[PDB]
């Protein structure tokens, strides 16, 4: 008995969406989802506003879903205050129209999001946990939403158990095309292994080529944007340097069947949750011009079950502030001339990347070792974060003797510190040599067995270790 | 659930004062629609009514005596200068989940002037006496407050197991109370022994107002 | 409320110009990109209070703001105004105005903050951020007492309502624009500004049109920011209502402005502010406390409410006597202990929410404060910390708030004037706290 | 605690010191008397006096950090010019030494 | 505007059908309910029902006992109450649900279903006069009636001022009221004075004259 309007913008099949919702048992809701799969050509948004109380006249619609194009953020600025004037609807939205618009009127009632931009910074901290390539500079223009961003980032980085410290933040508004030699002077303050960048992508095709001509082309591949700040992931222009960092949102993933599978099912169960602790629901309307006087019934304590109700174990609680508290991000390294390349899967603000090592674009000398106090002290990692402290370095341990079917690495990391550890760190500071520190498996300083050597000598006779 | 305590219930406050009631819920009810919580008013005999929509925002007809506020589990609901025509029971509790835990019962009392009860001694009348049974009746109509120990006496001997006590609310035209004590017995238990005495231990003064006569 | 039109203009970046609103929420140009102002917002009058700061050279306010975006923008405006005189005048009784306080709008007069203003001896009430609950503010002000002397009472033009006019005392000062004929005269002036804008536009280079066909033609109409820069270049000399050219955000930029005073329940005009020229009238200064005097500055008397925390050997405590007094105890020399009362912590015997207990309070502290009170001739009051801790600047995870924990946050908020303690000296404390010479030397 | 947070060399376990942080100083006295706490760090002006008055407790004698105790007020109260001098004035008659003798 | 009826005296474990007629609005746009106000002065919800008589809610003690129903054209609410307890002597109401659908919009005074273990009996009302003359009242004892209510006046139907009607006390499952009217020396006896008792539940009218023996 639920007035549901399904509106279509795009090219994907809607029938593959139909069985995405027709497969669930509808007996768990005790009220029938009456969906209405309507198509919609990409047309005038004022005609879409007319279409809103056209489909209200088609059926008393309480819940909507509407697929959307991926390049419509001004229309995302359009739709929300129309709702806050008149409706309490729900969309994903779709694509670029799912931009994080955190406007303050609570009567808009949209969940236009996944995670927030600040939640994207939060999982960017787990990226920082993964690579340990430091942030010393932060670059942005006047992109509204930056002061709270840098304040949250400073407040997090001042509460660390690690050696992570920030040195530079940069505000330079660059419509203003005269300030390219200013960035040539600002090369000194952008010397970081990892730099955060938040600008306008329309300006950034000029700005990134400017920064490449500044002398920052070698760091030009090591720059961070969210996928909303980034351009279209297919056919990215080459003024951006290749192999950049992708953060936020998904189309090659939970898709147009799956988003409406979140979708209507989330709506119908939330309504049944209003039928579960209140046993009621107010009636929807059909006369949008005149029923805007009839929003007296919109004492919306239903927003509790809007933001809190999950479905079938998938954590689907939301925040009313403009984000979802539960994450599903996307792959972390975008490629530019070629397509996105699937590298990272996100869950519980935690990354799954099947690499154990991260390259970039003088050599990593592979070094096997052995625990011996007070020289080599090997301890566990910080269990609040899984990594090492300020004066501590990771070390790579894997035992595959009990492995019988998948007899292969998959190293645990351990923390490592001690006397000679600081010595070899000083050597790596002097001769600028990177390394591959890992542990031994069999034999302390393993003896000669019929000519053959085990232990650390085994790694150097099999050339698995050049230094040890 | 949203289980709330109303302190102080049955509270006596002097006239023209701030009668503030603390409401302590188990869980919170605050939202962006200015509250969830909603309250109540009724007088005895009068139909039940509402008092608070969500907050000090009231519906209609409520005077400017009341001002209620608070959030979460706490609700400080004050009544500015109070008078003796609204001294009654109010403040329903409820939960936004389906078990709407009502009750609480904030009875309002006013610290009025204390009074010694006017005692009426009633033997059985003639029409009471032709039926075979009989009844003696104590009435107390002018007193504040209501807690009276009413004892009936025949020849000095006290009868308590047949005492039927029933008192009423604030009689507003006299700003006091009213109490009844009915003792229903046989005829010869009131006729052969004729010394009717009643005591009414009140809280105005420590001495009971005695009144004695013979059948 | 006109945003269904102006945001559609923002779809095509065509400018829109406010003629009848001072709502500062529309001044957010990060959302209202298309909006410009012939009428300045609500916040712009707040800066005029800074130009009040040299009238009788006042330097100290207490300020309570109802929690609004306009009020917070006014807070940012006055914080921008106050951060000045980085040198290198040096008699610095300048606008270090003592206070900023928050208030939940729409609530009622349960404000003990009025009593907290009564504790500070300030000569001001000046500003709130409403006009309808301001009569309730007047009721609560006359409840304790604020209508008499020792307080100056000042409002702007959007603080004025009949209910406020029912309870504003004769002597409160209002600051009003010259804005009555704006429906005709400033309308003609604004279309004179757009006449100059099109006189620049027609003698400009190749500029595209905002063509026929609406929002369905989703490409944004390139000449939008071109029209914005055309309006940025517009400079009107003078109009009927008086005109100074635009600001950096396209504002009206007044100096067409008047000051009135409520007297005989009417707003008699006392002077005109013109840009920098505060030109007062010939009228007398009526103030509601019985002036025609100049009560500049605030009175500075005190009963020194000093806080302290129990720490041996510096502080010792004993519970009480039977009368609540202390037992007369002698030293090894027979001298009395001279224990002050030291009304202790509420929720004492910690973990139990009991009440405060007047102690028997001794150590170095009472002898030092008796010596200081006989030195400076200072009346005082004893207070005890209920927390039992010195305190660190804990970053509260709610909105990233580094607040000094414990009693140090209380004296930061002015719950006490000073503290005697084994006071550890740190760099982070000295950025907020005045310190004296080190009384003790240890390690 | 802020001093040890400022020292990266005290990150050699500061967390241990957070795991055994206390609330009352007298409990830190008693846990040494109960032989649970091995060491308590505090200012000498309390430690040496309570050790010299209540026995079976001794200090290291080594001064770990140089420090003093002033008196703090809020900003712009002008009494300090006479307050600090009074601290000097109580220093001039030896009234501080009267506090020590008492 | 809102009137509840259809009560009566039902046994413990028995059944009845409560009813309500409400005027002022169309029923298909407003939820309706049934409310319980216990004589122990705590409230409960009997039931609630949708605008079309659709989605209902029955509480936990209700969900073996009671059944709500609603006609949306004819202004009638019905409530089948089966398997009652001893505490079902409550006052039962209906209220006109809120615009959020929960609280109320207005109220109605409501009827009373008496669920006790007694049968209908006429009130044995007997007058009470002493056997001053300045302040001693004249009373009546309404002994042995079931069920509630009983209205008591004095000889005209208009004597209401100075009239103290006291609540019912239980005696062998039979309720008992007391009543008094204040009399000065100008009306004692010097006139006719009776007590007039109307029992609508037993539908009797008792007229007992108050004549004193001595004073």
Short mmCIF file of N, CA and C in Angstrom, two decimals, chain C residues 152-245:
data_model
loop_
_atom_site.label_atom_id
_atom_site.label_comp_id
_atom_site.label_asym_id
_atom_site.label_seq_id
_atom_site.Cartn_x
_atom_site.Cartn_y
_atom_site.Cartn_z
N UNK C 152 24.17 50.77 30.38
CA UNK C 152 23.77 51.50 29.18
C UNK C 152 22.99 50.55 28.29
N UNK C 153 22.01 51.09 27.59
CA UNK C 153 21.02 50.32 26.85
C UNK C 153 21.00 50.82 25.42
N UNK C 154 21.38 49.97 24.48
CA UNK C 154 21.56 50.37 23.09
C UNK C 154 20.97 49.31 22.18
N UNK C 155 20.29 49.73 21.11
CA UNK C 155 19.74 48.80 20.13
C UNK C 155 20.04 49.31 18.72
N UNK C 156 19.82 48.44 17.74
CA UNK C 156 19.85 48.82 16.35
C UNK C 156 18.44 48.89 15.78
N UNK C 157 18.37 48.97 14.45
CA UNK C 157 17.07 49.15 13.82
C UNK C 157 16.24 47.87 13.81
N UNK C 158 16.87 46.70 13.69
CA UNK C 158 16.14 45.45 13.84
C UNK C 158 16.39 44.98 15.27
N UNK C 159 15.82 45.74 16.20
CA UNK C 159 15.56 45.33 17.56
C UNK C 159 14.25 45.96 18.01
N UNK C 160 13.51 46.52 17.07
CA UNK C 160 12.45 47.48 17.35
C UNK C 160 11.12 46.82 17.02
N UNK C 161 10.31 46.62 18.05
CA UNK C 161 8.94 46.16 17.89
C UNK C 161 8.10 46.87 18.93
N UNK C 162 6.78 46.86 18.71
CA UNK C 162 5.87 47.52 19.63
C UNK C 162 5.88 46.92 21.02
N UNK C 163 6.01 45.60 21.12
CA UNK C 163 6.13 44.95 22.42
C UNK C 163 7.42 45.34 23.11
N UNK C 164 8.53 45.37 22.35
CA UNK C 164 9.76 45.97 22.85
C UNK C 164 9.55 47.45 23.16
N UNK C 165 8.76 48.14 22.34
CA UNK C 165 8.43 49.53 22.63
C UNK C 165 7.50 49.66 23.83
N UNK C 166 6.83 48.57 24.22
CA UNK C 166 6.08 48.60 25.46
C UNK C 166 6.98 48.46 26.68
N UNK C 167 8.21 48.00 26.51
CA UNK C 167 9.07 47.71 27.65
C UNK C 167 10.49 48.25 27.49
N UNK C 168 10.75 49.03 26.47
CA UNK C 168 12.03 49.73 26.42
C UNK C 168 11.94 50.99 27.26
N UNK C 169 12.86 51.21 28.19
CA UNK C 169 12.81 52.42 29.00
C UNK C 169 13.32 53.62 28.22
N UNK C 170 12.83 54.80 28.61
CA UNK C 170 13.19 56.04 27.94
C UNK C 170 14.66 56.34 28.18
N UNK C 171 15.46 56.25 27.13
CA UNK C 171 16.89 56.46 27.26
C UNK C 171 17.69 55.45 26.48
N UNK C 172 17.03 54.39 26.01
CA UNK C 172 17.70 53.41 25.17
C UNK C 172 17.95 54.03 23.80
N UNK C 173 19.08 53.69 23.19
CA UNK C 173 19.56 54.33 21.97
C UNK C 173 19.37 53.38 20.80
N UNK C 174 18.78 53.87 19.72
CA UNK C 174 18.56 53.10 18.51
C UNK C 174 19.38 53.66 17.36
N UNK C 175 19.74 52.80 16.42
CA UNK C 175 20.53 53.19 15.25
C UNK C 175 19.78 52.72 14.01
N UNK C 176 19.29 53.67 13.22
CA UNK C 176 18.39 53.35 12.12
C UNK C 176 18.94 53.91 10.81
N UNK C 177 18.77 53.14 9.74
CA UNK C 177 19.06 53.60 8.39
C UNK C 177 18.11 54.72 7.98
N UNK C 178 18.48 55.43 6.92
CA UNK C 178 17.56 56.31 6.22
C UNK C 178 16.97 55.47 5.09
N UNK C 179 15.89 54.76 5.40
CA UNK C 179 15.37 53.72 4.53
C UNK C 179 13.86 53.74 4.34
N UNK C 180 13.20 54.88 4.58
CA UNK C 180 11.77 54.94 4.37
C UNK C 180 11.36 55.07 2.92
N UNK C 181 12.05 55.90 2.14
CA UNK C 181 11.72 56.14 0.75
C UNK C 181 12.43 55.19 -0.20
N UNK C 182 12.87 54.03 0.29
CA UNK C 182 13.58 53.07 -0.55
C UNK C 182 12.66 52.43 -1.58
N UNK C 183 11.35 52.45 -1.33
CA UNK C 183 10.40 51.87 -2.27
C UNK C 183 10.27 52.72 -3.53
N UNK C 184 10.63 54.00 -3.45
CA UNK C 184 10.63 54.86 -4.62
C UNK C 184 12.02 55.39 -4.95
N UNK C 185 12.65 56.07 -3.99
CA UNK C 185 13.88 56.80 -4.27
C UNK C 185 15.06 55.87 -4.51
N UNK C 186 15.25 54.89 -3.62
CA UNK C 186 16.34 53.95 -3.84
C UNK C 186 16.02 52.95 -4.95
N UNK C 187 14.74 52.76 -5.28
CA UNK C 187 14.39 52.01 -6.48
C UNK C 187 14.91 52.72 -7.72
N UNK C 188 14.65 54.03 -7.81
CA UNK C 188 15.17 54.83 -8.91
C UNK C 188 16.69 54.89 -8.89
N UNK C 189 17.30 54.90 -7.70
CA UNK C 189 18.75 54.90 -7.61
C UNK C 189 19.35 53.58 -8.08
N UNK C 190 18.72 52.46 -7.71
CA UNK C 190 19.22 51.15 -8.13
C UNK C 190 19.06 50.93 -9.62
N UNK C 191 17.96 51.41 -10.21
CA UNK C 191 17.88 51.30 -11.66
C UNK C 191 18.76 52.34 -12.35
N UNK C 192 19.17 53.40 -11.65
CA UNK C 192 20.26 54.22 -12.16
C UNK C 192 21.59 53.49 -12.15
N UNK C 193 21.81 52.65 -11.14
CA UNK C 193 23.01 51.81 -11.12
C UNK C 193 22.98 50.81 -12.27
N UNK C 194 21.81 50.22 -12.54
CA UNK C 194 21.75 49.30 -13.67
C UNK C 194 21.78 50.06 -15.00
N UNK C 195 21.42 51.34 -14.99
CA UNK C 195 21.60 52.18 -16.17
C UNK C 195 23.08 52.42 -16.45
N UNK C 196 23.87 52.66 -15.40
CA UNK C 196 25.31 52.73 -15.57
C UNK C 196 25.89 51.38 -15.98
N UNK C 197 25.31 50.29 -15.48
CA UNK C 197 25.78 48.95 -15.83
C UNK C 197 25.56 48.66 -17.31
N UNK C 198 24.39 49.03 -17.85
CA UNK C 198 24.16 48.81 -19.27
C UNK C 198 24.90 49.86 -20.12
N UNK C 199 25.17 51.05 -19.58
CA UNK C 199 26.01 52.01 -20.30
C UNK C 199 27.46 51.56 -20.37
N UNK C 200 27.91 50.74 -19.42
CA UNK C 200 29.18 50.04 -19.57
C UNK C 200 29.07 48.85 -20.51
N UNK C 201 27.94 48.14 -20.44
CA UNK C 201 27.74 46.88 -21.16
C UNK C 201 27.66 47.09 -22.67
N UNK C 202 26.94 48.13 -23.11
CA UNK C 202 26.78 48.41 -24.53
C UNK C 202 28.05 48.94 -25.17
N UNK C 203 28.97 49.49 -24.39
CA UNK C 203 30.25 49.96 -24.89
C UNK C 203 31.37 49.00 -24.49
N UNK C 204 31.02 47.73 -24.36
CA UNK C 204 31.95 46.66 -24.02
C UNK C 204 32.15 45.79 -25.26
N UNK C 205 33.04 44.80 -25.14
CA UNK C 205 33.41 43.94 -26.25
C UNK C 205 32.37 42.86 -26.50
N UNK C 206 32.74 41.85 -27.30
CA UNK C 206 31.86 40.74 -27.65
C UNK C 206 31.40 39.97 -26.43
N UNK C 207 30.11 40.08 -26.12
CA UNK C 207 29.50 39.48 -24.95
C UNK C 207 28.28 38.70 -25.43
N UNK C 208 28.21 37.42 -25.05
CA UNK C 208 27.11 36.57 -25.49
C UNK C 208 25.81 36.97 -24.79
N UNK C 209 24.72 36.41 -25.29
CA UNK C 209 23.42 36.72 -24.73
C UNK C 209 22.99 35.65 -23.75
N UNK C 210 22.06 35.96 -22.86
CA UNK C 210 21.31 34.92 -22.15
C UNK C 210 20.11 34.46 -22.96
N UNK C 211 20.29 33.49 -23.87
CA UNK C 211 19.34 33.33 -24.99
C UNK C 211 18.01 32.73 -24.57
N UNK C 212 17.14 32.58 -25.56
CA UNK C 212 15.80 32.04 -25.35
C UNK C 212 15.87 30.54 -25.07
N UNK C 213 15.00 30.07 -24.18
CA UNK C 213 15.02 28.68 -23.78
C UNK C 213 15.64 28.47 -22.41
N UNK C 214 14.92 27.81 -21.52
CA UNK C 214 15.20 27.77 -20.09
C UNK C 214 16.19 26.67 -19.73
N UNK C 215 16.17 26.28 -18.45
CA UNK C 215 16.98 25.30 -17.73
C UNK C 215 17.19 23.99 -18.49
N UNK C 216 16.27 23.64 -19.39
CA UNK C 216 16.47 22.52 -20.29
C UNK C 216 17.65 22.67 -21.22
N UNK C 217 18.01 23.91 -21.58
CA UNK C 217 19.27 24.18 -22.26
C UNK C 217 20.35 24.30 -21.19
N UNK C 218 20.86 23.13 -20.77
CA UNK C 218 21.59 23.01 -19.52
C UNK C 218 22.98 23.64 -19.54
N UNK C 219 23.48 24.08 -20.69
CA UNK C 219 24.76 24.78 -20.72
C UNK C 219 24.62 26.18 -20.14
N UNK C 220 25.56 26.55 -19.28
CA UNK C 220 25.43 27.77 -18.47
C UNK C 220 26.11 28.89 -19.25
N UNK C 221 25.37 29.41 -20.24
CA UNK C 221 25.13 30.84 -20.51
C UNK C 221 26.28 31.77 -20.14
N UNK C 222 27.43 31.59 -20.80
CA UNK C 222 28.77 32.11 -20.48
C UNK C 222 28.82 33.54 -19.94
N UNK C 223 27.97 34.41 -20.46
CA UNK C 223 27.89 35.81 -20.06
C UNK C 223 27.40 36.04 -18.61
N UNK C 224 27.15 35.03 -17.78
CA UNK C 224 26.75 35.22 -16.40
C UNK C 224 27.79 35.93 -15.53
N UNK C 225 28.97 35.32 -15.36
CA UNK C 225 30.06 36.03 -14.66
C UNK C 225 30.54 37.27 -15.38
N UNK C 226 30.34 37.35 -16.70
CA UNK C 226 30.55 38.60 -17.42
C UNK C 226 29.63 39.69 -16.91
N UNK C 227 28.33 39.38 -16.75
CA UNK C 227 27.39 40.32 -16.14
C UNK C 227 27.76 40.63 -14.70
N UNK C 228 28.31 39.65 -13.99
CA UNK C 228 28.77 39.88 -12.62
C UNK C 228 29.92 40.88 -12.58
N UNK C 229 30.86 40.78 -13.53
CA UNK C 229 31.96 41.73 -13.57
C UNK C 229 31.50 43.09 -14.08
N UNK C 230 30.47 43.12 -14.94
CA UNK C 230 29.84 44.37 -15.33
C UNK C 230 29.23 45.07 -14.12
N UNK C 231 28.55 44.30 -13.26
CA UNK C 231 28.01 44.87 -12.04
C UNK C 231 29.11 45.19 -11.02
N UNK C 232 30.24 44.49 -11.09
CA UNK C 232 31.38 44.82 -10.25
C UNK C 232 32.00 46.15 -10.64
N UNK C 233 31.92 46.51 -11.92
CA UNK C 233 32.51 47.75 -12.42
C UNK C 233 31.59 48.96 -12.28
N UNK C 234 30.34 48.76 -11.85
CA UNK C 234 29.38 49.85 -11.76
C UNK C 234 29.71 50.74 -10.56
N UNK C 235 29.67 52.05 -10.77
CA UNK C 235 30.00 53.02 -9.73
C UNK C 235 29.05 54.21 -9.83
N UNK C 236 28.04 54.24 -8.96
CA UNK C 236 27.06 55.31 -8.94
C UNK C 236 27.54 56.42 -8.01
N UNK C 237 27.54 57.65 -8.51
CA UNK C 237 28.08 58.77 -7.75
C UNK C 237 27.18 59.12 -6.56
N UNK C 238 25.95 59.54 -6.84
CA UNK C 238 25.03 59.88 -5.77
C UNK C 238 23.60 59.73 -6.25
N UNK C 239 22.72 59.39 -5.31
CA UNK C 239 21.30 59.25 -5.60
C UNK C 239 20.45 60.18 -4.76
N UNK C 240 19.14 59.93 -4.75
CA UNK C 240 18.22 60.76 -3.97
C UNK C 240 18.41 60.50 -2.48
N UNK C 241 18.52 59.23 -2.10
CA UNK C 241 18.71 58.85 -0.70
C UNK C 241 20.15 58.98 -0.24
N UNK C 242 21.05 59.50 -1.07
CA UNK C 242 22.45 59.53 -0.74
C UNK C 242 23.12 58.23 -1.12
N UNK C 243 24.27 58.31 -1.79
CA UNK C 243 24.87 57.10 -2.33
C UNK C 243 26.39 57.17 -2.25
N UNK C 244 26.97 56.14 -1.67
CA UNK C 244 28.40 55.85 -1.76
C UNK C 244 28.51 54.54 -2.53
N UNK C 245 29.58 54.40 -3.32
CA UNK C 245 29.74 53.30 -4.27
C UNK C 245 29.86 51.95 -3.56
#
